[model samples]
Target chain A: SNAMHEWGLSEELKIQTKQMIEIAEKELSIMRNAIDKEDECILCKMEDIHHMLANVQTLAATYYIQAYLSPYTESSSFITTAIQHLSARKHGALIVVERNETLEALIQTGTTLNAHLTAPLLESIFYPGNPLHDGAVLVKNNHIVSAANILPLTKSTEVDPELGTRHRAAIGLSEKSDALILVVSEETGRTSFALNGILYTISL
Target chain B: SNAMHEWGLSEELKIQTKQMIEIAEKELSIMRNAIDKEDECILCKMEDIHHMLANVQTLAATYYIQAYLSPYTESSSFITTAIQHLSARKHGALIVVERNETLEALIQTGTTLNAHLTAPLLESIFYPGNPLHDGAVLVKNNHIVSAANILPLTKSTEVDPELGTRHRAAIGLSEKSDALILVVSEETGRTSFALNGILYTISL
Candidate 1:
């Protein structure tokens, strides 16, 4: 509430601001009471934290790819090649290579960036505040087709208990499509890929 | 098998090597055929990948942590203050505060050099292969107990879907013990602390 005043909102919005203040005041009072009583609790969860994850996960994506590749190989390889190389080592990739080469016929789920794919650039997109942050980047023929796209989550309970959301998405994507889905695990950071219904861990 | 021969073992070991070589030879031939036939499929999967995860996970445990603290704030913060500070908005800690007045029973999980806790030193311990890595630091009455001790994982499905193993472990520890658990999540770098079965994500 004080923040709204500090930023100097327009007079037209001040009435709505008053309402926000009333609600916010109630929550603040509860929090203060929780803390004063020395009660252990989650104090404040908000939007910025989600923004923070975008950066962290993006750093992870970049880290693994760089973690996987040699400096000498950069110029010699395509971005898809880099994705393939990195995804096989422990980090996973959900690669949907153009099976029939008809882009419109594809079951793609994201904004079309039509961007030139590079490791650093892709990592940059996932940084906090970036438009594509938290969304998976889609690729075909070694070029980035889209990013900030959602992937389906797997329903199988039999998958490794340690696997995270991203890995499960890799599983779900592969199970539903004829694509070669690659995954790098958060717990293991090891490369694993899926085809048909089976997830295979492989050393590239 | 060839690798064993290159080591040039004694005659007794060589006989056993010969048996290993026979089986290894058969597998290698099958792999060669798969590659030569241009089949884009993995020939085998093994346990080394899992072993690799241990080391990679160790590195990660150290990495994002050091990535967070500022140099000025680095030396000033202890494990407890560090947790309290970071978890305010975007990090997590399962801080086991001082249970009693004495230093004798502290099992703090952080770095072990018994060095006064600082961000840099704490970060150093979490780096891969450090003796204090991966163990939860125990604190006694706000004083550090020990670092690198293990914490149990929580199996609660009621926890948030975005919560990971570490976050769950924080919940599990708090739920099982009198310990006060704190967490910062990746999805939002948000802060939360819990006791009993309830987890409260706080806005710091």
Candidate 2:
């Protein structure tokens, strides 16, 4: 069922992408043929193009994130569910989803869980005051492999000064491996994910 | 410099994504508030929303492909350049770019090249009747690791019957590993790339 779901997502993404590119190409052709148009028309067309490009940029980043994260996990719905509850409760959390690269050596291995990834289980593990809530949870192949894992802290001076240790660790691990690290801020209850050494705010 | 180029692309993508999401959010809010609007105005707004969604889909797919493939090699410019040349000349070629997964065990080792991957070098390898033009060229980290390497063929009956061996091989290898395989059809000179067992035509 997960495989089918993944296949469906990929197929839908491909179809949507093709349709959008076709629209863009048609619009570009229309603009190219309107070289002799009035200044007012040209300005209007330019604004439309600007808006279209912005839409494309936003859509591309969102889809890219989805495609990148989909393959490693069984279903991201559970993770999203967990994040929603964690953010609501202001339960600070760090989650590392392993990709192609093995992350055992990159992190200090903590309590072995090796349990199927579920929203309530994930939420409980990250619940405030729980012994395992202090560190990151390692997820591999739809399973929660471990908890309380200590990740490397980012050494880069370019990171935002206000980010706490959790955010730094997420960035540091992402810099070294292909792991996707999700963070929920204890201070702001804001959610973000780290990839390729960059922190991105996650909305829904 | 290539690293800088990549950094620039990533930063630009992030900024563009944020901007587009903001625009989408504002538009959605407007639509939500317009629940009591006249039918004609509602229809017009709905059409605008549809177009915006289409634009996002296309842009997301394009950017996802770029971000997915960017980190593996130094610069994809050379690959694009080579594909252009090969397509124009109707030269049949199969080029495999290794990603996070090691491909050695999956492919039959061919002539070891270990040469810097350039447009000229790649073009020459796939040139008609060239000694090493029969099989796929393996590229690892911007180096042409080997050529004339045999790749696994797709066993899926779902593949189009009209498609040739090169396309099949591209799909096969992609199905097996995280490698991105580019294909140049000698019959029509069309270019495509296989990723995650799906073949996508190259537009640029």
Candidate 3:
């Protein structure tokens, strides 16, 4: 069953990447040919090339993240569903998914629910103005281990000026541990995740 | 200038992700409505939903990777170009980009090129049957620090059976340090990266 799952995942990635590569290569070839010929519409042709490259970049980043996150979480679907809803509603959220490393020493524990992870329940916890909405939710082995947990803030000044406390906390914890940290921006409704001390944007 | 780059990056992500979210929500709503109405063509509707969801996953993953890699290397475009060419030719390659951590103690360094990194140069180094093609290339701050370096092999039994020595080395190095390792499979021409002890598939 695990082998089948891996096969399915790889097949999906292969299919998607192949299509993206085709489009990107075609766009790149066209741009290069136009440049060689000094076509009058060279500037206009550049637009599609840039757009396709950006799409390729986004597609590659998304799959890379899925590969890492898949091995650690069975509640991935539920997390995705909850994140989508939260992003759509512009609700701020911080979720920490533990991996090989334990997060106990790195975080201040809050209310320990120890409930099975679910979309609706996860959504409600981060709903606007909720009591436990301000802090991070901890997940371990497909269970919501705790909520309202205070994560360490990053001391790095290199962070983006636009990012808020939620994102900082996400990056901070990820830097110190192997945990996968997901954040939903209340300000922009954008979803992002942090791992290996780096943060990335994701589509809801 | 850095702020401008961030603004441009975020703006691009916002535009792409917004479009994706719109399409996903629409498909999901249609699927839900069809289920409620007991539509006879439910299975057919499910196909498009799955396809859209998969696309969302890829796009999110791609962006996530870009965010992490962008901060570490100025030669990302060069790395991407090299990978694309290597994948097209089915030339197996492993390229490690050093991040906040030093990799000197972790890897057995080989030829010290200390050359300025460029797409063409990287491509040649990893060309099929080349002397340096058998080992990993170490990149640091937009320079090719070394080539033909030997990396540690992962001992975990959790690895996918389809993976080979190059991939094992990628994961092993990543597990021990904060380095980004890129791998191209000679057998399948597939591109993948290892970071924070996890391997991810990326489009060429």
Candidate 4:
């Protein structure tokens, strides 16, 4: 993916990107077919389509991080930096869907493959609000579903569409001057929403 | 309103429904514009949009329930029961939404707003098991942003596309059994996710 001084990681990352794209394409396509051709509920089918697309989106971003990071960047720190960087900024996103109940929290959690994330990204597997502290990942039976964030708060009086996904959601949820971000996860928890720049746990 | 059987509500219900619709329209318009105006991000939005929409739909549905049923059955109990009865079986929904995060013990506290009934219904709000026994309605101080059904079990299982709005969405959701039946308050929960056929409720 890089066109710089470093050697091409394209062999690996390009395949990864293609695989990611295929994942999104196939799922979205399948869902569209289910919805369009079958006697399906549009929203339910649409939710599945959306879930695939969002996951692809998140994974695509993760792959890009590996491609773009400086070659000298260490592996462990590189991963954390990449995740934090993504988390710190606004990401592309759709408005939170309120159709099926799964759609809400599905919109909240962010997904990641182990290689996709340098640091294990948080997830809300079966519920919103991770029971792990005010901000730790809450899990049942050792399965992580929702996680808390340590996002930086941004102060802005005007709405900025350029803000990353979670950042915008953060701003939307802001009370007074406090802005927050709520990103979407497509795996266990799928879908991302944002306001200013910080990610918020979808709480009960 | 209702056929002079529910609550016999006044014009307030219509006024409220209209107001809620306007709010939903605003949020939707903003989100839609964001998509067309901004660069595409790679991410899935199905679930989040679903949950957020549920928030919007039910806002409208609650009003619809009030406006429609109150005119027929004024009892809040009747409204609650009608909501519970009318929609549950159709979609096999559970009350993932409550006034707060009321648990299954609500029966002891009073009426178990979050009932954990058996059978066809399930725990898919947050996927797997929802935090509360109900779906959540993110509110602004006092207003409910979303909603949930109490007894979302079905004696019958069928996905009849031609069967009106409620019947269709219910069966559609039933196909996923994993998907939730949500109505965005924005559409005043009027987009047909609200099920029909009120066989029973707690008191109404």
DockQ of every candidate structure: 0.01, 0.02, 0.02, 0.01
Weakest lDDT window of 10 consecutive positions for candidate 1 chain B = B67-76
| lDDT of model 4, residue B183 | 35
lDDT of 4 at B57: 57
Evaluated at residue A174, the lDDT of candidate 2 is 98
Clashes of 2: 3
Q: Pick the candidate with the highest TM-score.
A: 3
Please give, for residues B77-170, the per-residue lDDT of candidate 3 as tens digits. 6788888898999999999999899999999988999999998999889888878888999999688999999999999899998789999999
Off by over 4 Å in 1: A1-76, A80-95, A101-108, A126-130, B1-204
True interface contacts retained by model 3: 0.00
Give the clashing pairs for model 3. Answer: A60-B62, A61-B61, A61-B62, A61-B63, A62-B60, A62-B61, A62-B62, A63-B61
Per-residue lDDT over B1-204 for candidate 2, one digit per residue giving the tens place of the 0 to 100 score: 233355558667666666666667788888887777665365567777776666565455446546767768765778878988899889999999999999999999889988888999999999899799999999997789999999999999998899999999999999999999999999989888899899987644
Candidate 4 per-residue C-alpha lDDT over B127-204 given as tens digits, one digit per residue, 9 for 90 to 100:
323443333322111123233423333434443323443333343333333222333221122223332322111111
Per-candidate TM-scores read 0.28, 0.42, 0.48, 0.21
Find the 10 residues in a row with the least total lDDT in model 2 chain A.
A57-66
Candidate 2, residue A11: the lDDT equals 49
Model 3 over residues A59-174: C-alpha lDDT tens digits?
A: 66556655766667777779988998999999999999998898899999888999999999899999889888989999986899999999998888888977799999999999
- Preferred candidate (lDDT higher): 1 or 4: 1
Question: A14-113 in candidate 1: lDDT tens per residue?
Answer: 3343445555555555656666564556346334344444444444433333323222123214554454444444333344443333434334567787
Candidate 1 CAPRI-style tier = incorrect
